[PDB]
């Protein structure tokens, strides 16, 4: 499932809740920006095998 999100920030709620309700981790380009935000970092992944 692709998620065509135009804005850079604002859709983290959808990502986190989908990850919590499905156990799958959403794929994004960059995630180092959330390195100090544990509740968001553990829901994103750079691997393309998701």
């Amino acid at each position: 499932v692709w998620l065509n999100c135009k804005a850079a920030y604002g859709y983290e709620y959808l990502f986190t809740n989908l990850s919590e309700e499905l156990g799958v981790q959403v794929h994004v380009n960059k995630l180092d920006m959330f390195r100090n935000m544990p509740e968001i970092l553990h829901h994103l992944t750079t691997d393309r095998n998701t």
Binding site: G10, E12, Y13, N36, M37, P38, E39, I40
Partner: protein, 412 residues
């Protein structure tokens, strides 16, 4: 044997930390405090907890909107932390056993033969954990028929909770459930007579204050609530672990909120009219109160410096009536920490002074001139806090009307 046959004795019973606290889970502790405060004490004057300990049924608007903007997203703490819960209630013989007990109950009082057997199987720490957990759940589901005999069942549940090898790690739902049951039983039986019950309650309190923190705000508030009601019920039986609290509010990190937990624990201790320090611990009075007051220099998070100022003010008010010999040194340290940022930032200074003088008025007599100087330069809530600081000391002032006239009080 008959019980070890109908129990697995080998399944790792997963007990997760309850996250989604229901609405009755709060009112049960509310009514527990209501009973232990008037039905057994008869005073009807609940302890006035600090502003940081003011609780609401629901969550604030900031908590609800934090799901989108992540206002609390930045990792500020540093503590290491981690229906599929009632699997014991989903046992084959669980409901039949509860029905049997409820039927046979209605079919200084001493325990009958079956209650004697249950006590021998539960209180024994060598019985496997699964059987003791099943018996605890049975007592929970049938607490109404164990109340007239709760004087005997107090110690087994206490030593089961205080045991280091419990069901799960941390404060899970079984712990809070048995604690609520025991605190509901406190109206008739209290751990005050047998020193074994005293040491069990002390170890339980130490375990509670050891794992009180949890990144989720709701379960953290729930843990603070259960610790609060436990220390309120057993106020005359517990020795406060001041060493753990000291390590809790002494972090020496300007960009962390670790000291907030210790400050809130100290506030819970102080709200029940308890001593703020006992020299039995390895920490002397100098460094203890020094590290306590040093929290007012952490001017990043209000939950640290404002809470520290308020709890310090409560401690000063307490040592004022008790006529202790450390009131002078504490007041000097507080005045020094206040004057340190009286001129640097001057916005945290007024907040800390208002938090201190909220319970210790006699401290504002040395900063009245400073607050009168700062009054014309403040706006918003800061001017209101300055006016409140002026209000806390009005009768003691010799001639006040001239200063207010000079500070354009009428247009204020």
């Amino acid at each position: 044997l008959i019980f070890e046959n109908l129990i697995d004795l080998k399944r790792r019973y997963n007990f997760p930390v309850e996250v989604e606290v229901p609405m009755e889970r709060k009112k049960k502790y509310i009514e527990i405090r209501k009973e232990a405060r008037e039905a057994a004490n008869g005073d009807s004057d609940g302890p006035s907890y600090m502003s940081s300990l003011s609780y609401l049924a629901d969550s604030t608007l900031s908590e609800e909107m934090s799901q989108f903007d992540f206002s609390t997203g930045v990792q500020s703490y540093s503590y290491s932390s981690q229906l599929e819960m009632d699997e014991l209630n989903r046992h084959e013989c669980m409901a039949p056993l509860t029905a049997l007990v409820k039927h046979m109950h209605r079919s200084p009082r001493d325990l009958p033969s079956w209650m004697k057997f249950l006590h021998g199987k539960l209180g024994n720490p060598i019985v496997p954990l699964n059987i003791r957990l099943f018996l605890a759940k049975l007592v929970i589901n049938t607490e109404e028929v164990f109340r007239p005999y709760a004087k005997h069942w107090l110690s087994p549940l206490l030593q089961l909770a205080a045991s280091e090898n419990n069901g799960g790690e941390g404060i899970h739902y079984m712990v809070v459930e048995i604690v609520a049951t025991i605190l509901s039983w406190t109206g008739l039986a209290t751990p005050t007579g047998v020193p074994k019950d005293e040491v069990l309650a002390n170890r339980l309190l130490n375990f509670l204050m050891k794992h009180v923190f949890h990144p989720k705000r709701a379960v953290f508030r729930h843990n603070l609530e259960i610790i609060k009601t436990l220390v309120e019920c057993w106020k005359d039986c517990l020795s406060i672990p001041y060493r753990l609290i000291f390590e809790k509010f002494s972090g020496k990190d300007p960009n962390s909120k670790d000291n907030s937990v210790g400050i809130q624990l100290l506030g819970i201790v102080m709200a029940n009219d308890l001593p703020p320090y006992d020299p039995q611990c390895g920490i002397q009075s100098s460094e203890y109160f020094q590290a306590l007051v040093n929290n007012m220099s952490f001017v990043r998070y209000k939950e640290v410096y404002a809470a520290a100022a308020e709890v310090l003010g409560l401690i000063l008010r307490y040592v004022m009536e008790r006529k202790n010999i450390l009131e002078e040194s504490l007041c000097e340290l507080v005045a020094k920490q206040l004057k340190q940022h009286q001129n640097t930032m001057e916005d945290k200074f007024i907040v800390c002074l208002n938090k201190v003088t909220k319970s210790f008025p006699p401290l504002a007599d040395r900063f009245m001139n400073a607050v009168f100087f700062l009054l014309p330069k403040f706006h918003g809530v800061l001017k209101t806090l300055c006016l409140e600081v002026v209000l806390c000391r009005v009768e003691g002032m010799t001639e006040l009307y001239f200063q207010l006239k000079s500070k354009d009080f009428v247009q204020v």
